[PDB]
């Protein structure tokens, strides 16, 4: 791309991909921590990435957070009219409703002119209540759909920021801090070496399940996220990262 | 102050206040948007420093949401649905209207996530859980309610009312509906949709209630709902008001 070439993004993408061993790196100009439109541009870039990767039939698992909400906001109908079903990856993870995967999922599906199926399993159910709810045919059906996701679109967060944003019990805050968590993705907190140090108790997709998902797109940027993004990608994730100059330049510095 | 039509409607229906926009929303669809605009202005006049606003679904309150704008006074705004599922399709559900209105207001919101395809047993489990109780408690503390009014038969059909309940609604001569309750011509409850959240007895404690409903087809339904004292502000149109008052 001549735009990417003149802006130095082509080189920055190659350098970032090599540094993090990514399947691919897509970087938009600017720093989303400073300039609001940059998050929207990450959203647009992620949508392009998704459309390039869709097949004839698609089950797209999505996480919540403001970044995947920006992907949803930038989503448009498929000109090839391929079959699109959107589901949340997990149960919502203690996010307020605006930031929950169900909310992002519904928004994305409407914008894509696709269909969606939501997962309603509250995070603080008693053992007994949980046992009954997961046997419910409607819950089983959504969980089974998630098990066959062909695509995952997910955010990445700094550990402390995420622990604070969600309704994280004191007991869990202590564990997150004691084990030096630096980054978070889809209900897992990781340390600087990309090892899992704390897991949010949820339903749906688990970390081991991503290996079976052919197309995974992480969308996260802003200089504040540089260490979080680096830590997450310490492990093989077979993932395309959509990010911005803010995060990428800080990471590479 | 009030026009003679507004003054007459306020007296006739024992309203806290009447706001009547021009035209008949059953003939001129955009008039629903003008009811929405007037309702938003009314809400803004009644806000305190901190607010918990319970809202119903339906196209009229969706129009309120569409016309909502942020508060120039920057008052604290938390929106919630009044009740759980009432059997509306997604576009007409209180949860949908609630999220839309909150976004337009730059406020915050909480949703109720109840019945759906779930068993009674699984349903009861959900309503016991901490976050769900929190929303129910928030609704219980509402400082404002913004609700629609519909014709009973129309509303029963739009929702997916079981045949046995359709028969009961008909047999008891329901004529009007609001927030999941069906009322006869004397404004007495004759059938209720089962749903968590706000109950009819709870409206008395809510300081500001704004009903938004118009169109000549709703004149009978509006009159009947207000046959009992509701201490409510009605935002309506000339279509409804003139027909109700026999002034056209
Ligand atoms: O895009 P944001 O707003 O930074 O949030 C990202 C976070 O949201 C989630 O995707 C959902 O909780 C987290 O896994 C991730 O840490
Ligand atoms: O504004 P509409 O579309 O006529 O619907 C009014 C109806 O919508 C609801 O508020 C929601 O179901 C009902 O209580 C009310 O009767």
UniProtKB/Swiss-Prot annotation, chain B:
Query: Could you identify this protein by its name?
Result: Central glycolytic genes regulator
Q: Which UniProt keywords apply?
A: DNA-binding, Repressor, Transcription, Transcription regulation
Organism taxonomic ancestry: Bacteria, Bacillati, Bacillota, Bacilli, Bacillales
The UniProt record gives the binding positions of beta-D-fructose 1,6-bisphosphate as 57-60, 83, 93, 158-159, 177, 218
Family from the record: Belongs to the SorC transcriptional regulatory family.
Q: Any notes on this protein's domains?
A: Contains an N-terminal DNA-binding domain and a large C-terminal effector-binding domain. Contains two distinct sugar-binding sites with different affinities.
Q: Tell me, what controls this protein's activity?
A: Stability and function are regulated by the effector molecule fructose-1,6-bisphosphate (FBP). In the presence of glucose, binding of FBP to the low-affinity sugar-binding site of CggR disrupts dimer/dimer bridging interactions and triggers a tetramer to dimer transition, which leaves two physically independent dimers on the target DNA and allows transcription of the downstream coding sequences by the RNA polymerase. In addition, FBP and several other phosphorylated compounds can bind to a high-affinity binding-site and protect CggR against aggregation and proteolysis.
Report where the shown chain sits in the full-length sequence: first residue, last residue, total length.
Answer: 93 to 340 of 340
Give the protein's function.
In the absence of glucose, represses the transcription of the gapA operon, which encodes five key glycolytic enzymes. Binds specifically to the cggR-gapA promoter region and blocks the progression of the RNA polymerase, leading to the arrest of the transcription.
> Molecular function (GO) terms listed?
carbohydrate binding; cis-regulatory region sequence-specific DNA binding
Look up and give the organism this protein is from. Answer: Bacillus subtilis (strain 168)
Q: How does it assemble?
A: Homotetramer. Binds primarily as a dimer to each half-site of the full-length operator, with much higher affinity for the right site. Then, both dimers interact, bridging the two-half sites of the operator region.
């Amino acid at each position: 791309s001549n735009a990417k070439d003149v802006l130095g993004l082509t080189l920055l993408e190659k350098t970032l991909k090599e540094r993090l061993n990514l399947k691919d790196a897509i970087i938009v100009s600017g720093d989303s921590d400073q300039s609001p439109w940059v998050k929207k541009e990450m959203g647009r870039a992620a949508v392009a990435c998704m459309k390039k990767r869709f097949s004839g039939k698609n089950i797209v698992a999505v996480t919540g957070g403001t970044t995947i909400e920006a992907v949803a906001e930038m989503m448009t109908p498929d000109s090839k009219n391929r079959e699109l079903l959107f589901v949340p990856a997990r149960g919502g993870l203690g996010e307020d409703v605006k930031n929950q995967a169900n909310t992002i999922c519904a928004h994305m599906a409407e914008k894509a002119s696709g269909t969606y199926r939501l997962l309603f399993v509250p995070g603080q159910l008693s053992q007994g209540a949980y046992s009954s709810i997961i046997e419910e045919p409607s819950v089983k059906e959504v969980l089974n759909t998630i098990k066959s996701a062909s695509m995952l679109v997910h955010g990445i967060g700094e550990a402390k920021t995420m622990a604070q944003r969600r309704n994280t019990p004191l007991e869990d805050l202590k564990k997150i801090d004691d084990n030096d968590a630096v980054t978070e993705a889809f209900g897992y907190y990781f340390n600087a070496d990309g090892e899992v140090v704390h897991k949010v108790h949820s339903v749906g997709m688990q970390l081991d399940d991503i290996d079976a998902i052919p197309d995974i797109i992480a969308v996260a940027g802003g200089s504040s996220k540089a260490e979080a993004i680096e830590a997450y990608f310490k492990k093989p994730r077979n993932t395309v990262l959509v990010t911005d100059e803010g995060a990428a330049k800080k990471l590479l510095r």
